[PDB]
Design a protein around this nucleic acid. Structure first.
Lengths: 252, 56, 135, 77, 91, 50, 97
RNA sequence: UUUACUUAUUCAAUGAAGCGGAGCUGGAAUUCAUUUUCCACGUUCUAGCAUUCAAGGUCCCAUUCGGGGCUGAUCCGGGUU
RNA sequence: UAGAACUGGUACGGACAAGGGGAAUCUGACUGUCUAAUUAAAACAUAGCAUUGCGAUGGUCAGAAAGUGAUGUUGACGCAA
RNA sequence: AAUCCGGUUAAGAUUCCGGAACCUGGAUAUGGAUUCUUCACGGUAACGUAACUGAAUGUGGAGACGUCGGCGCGAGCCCUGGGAGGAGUUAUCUUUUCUUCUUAACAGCUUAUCACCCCGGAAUUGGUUUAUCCGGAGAUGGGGUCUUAUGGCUGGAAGAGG
């Protein structure tokens, strides 16, 4: 049996990201003294398109406090920002759309985005276009914060972690029908070599486990265990349920 | 072309204002007005604290 | 009401002297024969006196306090009139319409303006008019 | 390259002590459409460039050739 | 004239793709290619380029926004939420 | 530009000019002679309404 | 509201429209009131406040944008700032300015 | 018990830059003797500016033309956080 | 560009150049791809629909290991199956 | 970073020959300009002028950019009129048929959309594009400034080439 495609993505030869036209990593401002005590202002000079990413980036330029220069950093644009806007980072920053505040200083029910997991990693959670997390609770005991991640799976993070206020720009993006195969081509050509995926049913018993047969069918069950080994895992991994759902949403 | 500028006289690479060859007219004009009025407005933000914080 | 009277400090916002502080010495509101627009004859300074310290030597003070003045006709739209003011009757009679064309007279006028503004920079009245507007 | 128009400047050029050679070219043209005339051109060789002076009148060129420094290597025609 | 009965812009796709997908694309491309009102200069010039980015044609201000419209309804509530939550700190 | 040279020649005012311009951006005028005879017609109507 | 008052101004008084002509009337001191739209830029807003304090003419802010102010003065085009210089039957020189 | 530790091991960021404790003014705070207490402790109409051991103040040096010390910028422990 | 006489042994896109059409059914929606040296298809792909895993001291995958790596100049409107 | 033309050999040429240039690196003088208003004047302005100090350090620009569609303008070509030469056909006809009439890199003066500046104040809304955009955040109109891709004129250069 041949080594199959989904195993083969991991040597990462042709399946890498296509990072040429990317403006930069979209990290937040490095947490320094001016941020965790007072606050600091930048002008956002140009908000600019990014390739592969859906949401636009934003050129927020801060003054370096320690030598006379300018440090120009790349935010994900919140929706509603504009060029020329002042952006105030810090613990005592006011709460307007685009100021990046620690989560220890926001009231509960505040809609933030680009929020950090551990404080000091510069922007991990809730970053794709149109997402946000919501602070639903605080905990002044051991200073934690109870947030709602965009998949609904709620989380408790440190309150020294930082998040920027507002939705992320590019909303309603996946509502348009990507009418034809060419648009999917020019979409995924600036991301990676994932496309076009051939079904494993069509291919051969060397090529895949769903191959073979004198009929296009799967053979055994398509759900494979979590504990099964790399190479078998081609299908619905560790699937607890399957099939089409019933009932109304917003589950308990 | 960028290296041609090395030969040519300075009057080809400059207009005689402040921020001459690098910012245009009106932008210079705007960063006077802004840079004036702000540091006039900021003067008021010291005489507010000489009146409010004194009357505390 | 009429706030372009003959003592106001302005900041010139167009022309070669953009961003430099003048005073109006004689406003012409209605206009003139030429210049069919409200222009004021201004006297300003072109190089600023650089900031002297406790430790500059005697002659090194003098080279720091040199002032290069200028005279100009300027339109009202090219001025920011500010709330400041300046006692200008020292050289009120020097700047005129006769001070211009016949340009040899302008250097004799600039000498008078330079003498007056150095005599106000020494004994440092008008601290705002003598620091560089910075932008 | 250059064309230099002043006669006095041209005499300054011919005394520049690095102009080694000069030449005179006699061309023939005609005013407006009417009548032929003799144009002359004086060309002095600089160390970089080559200066010319167009004289459309014979009565001034006749004295101007006489005004040349005799140390100058002149190629007439 | 008025040249198509119902398709309008999506008539450039012709016959293809099905009609529900084409009516769905029409409903968004009218939003996308229309010319919007500027929040600052008061003119009607904000046209997107570069999906998510809404430049004004004069005035040079550049509002990040929705991918297919200026600010979607599930975003303009958020600032109103902020407009509410900034008030609990003082009054 | 027949419209333009009639405006610059003072044989028409700016209001009738701006009417006729957007009329000529639609069809309304097959050729130069037809528009000149239309200028005569509307201008004589305005003269009779003077 | 305030709009009926400006309408009585605009049919019974003397006024001037838009920034450059306000500053022409203001440096000549014919100004008596200036009305600024809300979406005016903050720099132009400050430049008109600062010219107002030299003439000591009080500033009223028109709550509402420049399109609404363009309608409110009876014109059709947008206007950013109005300068009332001679009021007629209306009394907004003395109401709350 | 799973509690508490940081020094092993582990993770992450920074041209390892302002940690930890104490004090200093204000101020919530009510005094049950006098302060028992905690918060603050330079920047928010603006697409401007911010760089020369820092100006100022104060003591030297040997007055040259300049240099030096302290403060402006609270101490203490060197545990980058 | 339209039109009119007039004329040719009714000839005239004069050589060249240059669509056969219609009623239907099975099937794949389409445009696209492939067994280069026997198969270009009803296969493959695709949009569209749906499902499964996953909140990074993670999901999938690589490596003999390693202070190693791909997706990741990523963060659930995303990645992976 | 920076060059072209004309000619040349049996076989090389943007490389050789003749002419005309430029660019870099480094030397250096002379003139000019600046100065006793010690580091230039002019213009309301856009900016102009042969020049007209300037370190560390910071900022900005050029380098620097998709594809399609018409539209304008240039270059070369194609066509074509008069004229100065040469070759062909001529039983008849044809002021006829073919052909040469060329100008470089570089330099100086000058030349445009677009953009910008001044005066002015717009609804009996006005400009304007093949294509509907623009104006009280100041249009139309009067008058100016700039880029010089490009084009003209003069030099190169008619002494070359035909």
């Amino acid at each position: 049996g041949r080594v199959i495609r989904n195993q083969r993505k991991g040597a990462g030869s042709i399946f890498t990201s296509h990072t040429r036209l990317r403006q930069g990593a979209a990290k937040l401002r490095t947490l320094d003294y001016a941020e965790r005590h007072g606050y600091i202002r930048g002008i956002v000079k140009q908000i600019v398109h990014d390739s592969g990413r859906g949401a636009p980036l934003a050129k927020v330029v801060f003054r370096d406090p320690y030598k006379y220069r300018l440090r120009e950093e790349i935010f994900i644009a919140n929706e509603g920002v504009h060029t020329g806007q002042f952006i105030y980072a810090g613990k005592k920053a006011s709460l307007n759309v685009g100021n990046v505040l620690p989560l220890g200083s926001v009231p509960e029910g505040t809609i933030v985005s680009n929020v950090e997991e551990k404080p000091g990693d510069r922007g991990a959670l809730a970053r794709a276009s149109g997402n946000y997390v919501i602070i639903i609770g605080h905990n002044p005991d051991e200073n934690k914060t109870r947030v709602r991640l965009p998949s609904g799976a709620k989380k408790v993070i440190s309150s020294d972690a930082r998040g920027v206020i507002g939705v992320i720009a590019g909303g309603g993006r996946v509502d348009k029908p990507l009418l034809k195969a060419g648009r999917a081509f020019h979409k995924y050509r600036l991301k990676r070599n994932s496309w076009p995926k051939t079904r494993g049913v069509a291919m051969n018993p060397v090529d895949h486990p769903h191959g073979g047969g004198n009929h296009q069918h799967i053979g055994k069950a398509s759900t494979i265990s979590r504990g099964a080994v790399s190479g078998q895992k081609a299908g619905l991994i560790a699937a607890r349920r399957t099939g089409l759902l019933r009932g109304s949403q917003k589950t308990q | 072309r960028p290296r041609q500028y090395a030969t040519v006289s300075k009057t080809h690479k400059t207009v005689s204002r402040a921020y001459g060859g690098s910012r245009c007219a009106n932008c210079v004009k705007e960063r006077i007005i802004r840079a004036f009025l702000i540091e006039e407005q900021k003067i008021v933000k010291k005489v507010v604290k000489e009146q409010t914080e004194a009357a505390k | 009401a009429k706030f372009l009277k003959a003592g106001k400090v302005a900041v010139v916002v167009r022309g070669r002297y953009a961003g430099k502080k003048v005073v109006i010495v004689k406003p012409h509101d209605e206009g003139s024969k030429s210049h069919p627009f409200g222009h004021a004859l201004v006297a300003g300074i072109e190089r600023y006196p650089l900031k002297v310290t406790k430790k500059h030597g005697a002659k090194k003070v003098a080279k720091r306090t040199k002032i290069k003045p200028f005279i100009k006709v300027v339109n009202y739209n090219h001025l920011l009139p500010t709330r400041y003011t300046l006692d200008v009757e020292a050289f009120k009679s020097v700047v005129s319409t006769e001070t211009f064309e016949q340009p040899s007279q302008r250097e004799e006028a600039k000498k008078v303006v330079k003498k007056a503004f150095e005599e106000r920079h020494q004994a440092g009245k008008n601290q705002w008019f003598f620091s560089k507007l910075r932008f | 390259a250059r064309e230099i128009t002043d006669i006095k400047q041209f005499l300054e050029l011919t005394r520049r002590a690095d102009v080694k050679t000069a030449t005179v070219k006699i061309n023939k043209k005609l005013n407006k459409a009417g009548k032929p005339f003799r144009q002359t051109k004086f060309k002095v060789r600089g160390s970089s460039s080559l200066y010319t002076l167009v004289i459309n009148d014979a009565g001034k060129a006749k004295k101007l050739i006489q005004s040349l420094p005799p140390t100058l290597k002149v190629n007439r025609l | 004239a008025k040249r198509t009965k119902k398709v309008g812009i999506t008539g450039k796709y012709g016959v293809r793709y099905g009609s529900s997908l084409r009516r769905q694309v029409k409903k968004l491309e009218i939003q996308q290619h229309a010319r919007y009102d500027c929040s600052f200069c008061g003119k009607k010039t904000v046209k997107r380029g570069a999906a998510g980015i809404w430049t004004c044609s004069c005035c040079k201000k550049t509002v990040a926004g929705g991918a297919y419209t200026v600010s979607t309804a599930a975003a303009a509530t958020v600032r109103s939420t902020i407009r509410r939550l900034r008030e609990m700190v003082e009054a | 530009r027949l419209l333009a040279k009639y405006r610059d020649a003072g044989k028409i005012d700016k209001h009738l000019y701006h009417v006729l311009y957007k009329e000529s951006k639609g069809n309304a005028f097959k050729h130069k002679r037809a528009l000149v005879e239309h200028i005569i017609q509307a201008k004589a109507d305005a003269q009779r309404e003077k | 509201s305030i709009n009926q008052k400006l309408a009585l101004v605009i049919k019974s008084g003397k006024y001037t429209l838009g920034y450059k002509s306000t500053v022409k009337s203001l440096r000549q001191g014919k100004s008596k009131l200036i009305i600024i739209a809300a979406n005016t830029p903050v720099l132009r807003k400050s430049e008109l406040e600062y010219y107002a304090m030299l003439s000591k003419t009080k500033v009223y802010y028109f709550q509402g944008g420049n399109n609404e102010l363009g309608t409110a003065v009876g014109k059709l085009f947008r206007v950013g700032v109005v300068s009332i210089l001679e009021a007629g039957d209306s009394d907004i020189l003395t109401t709350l300015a």
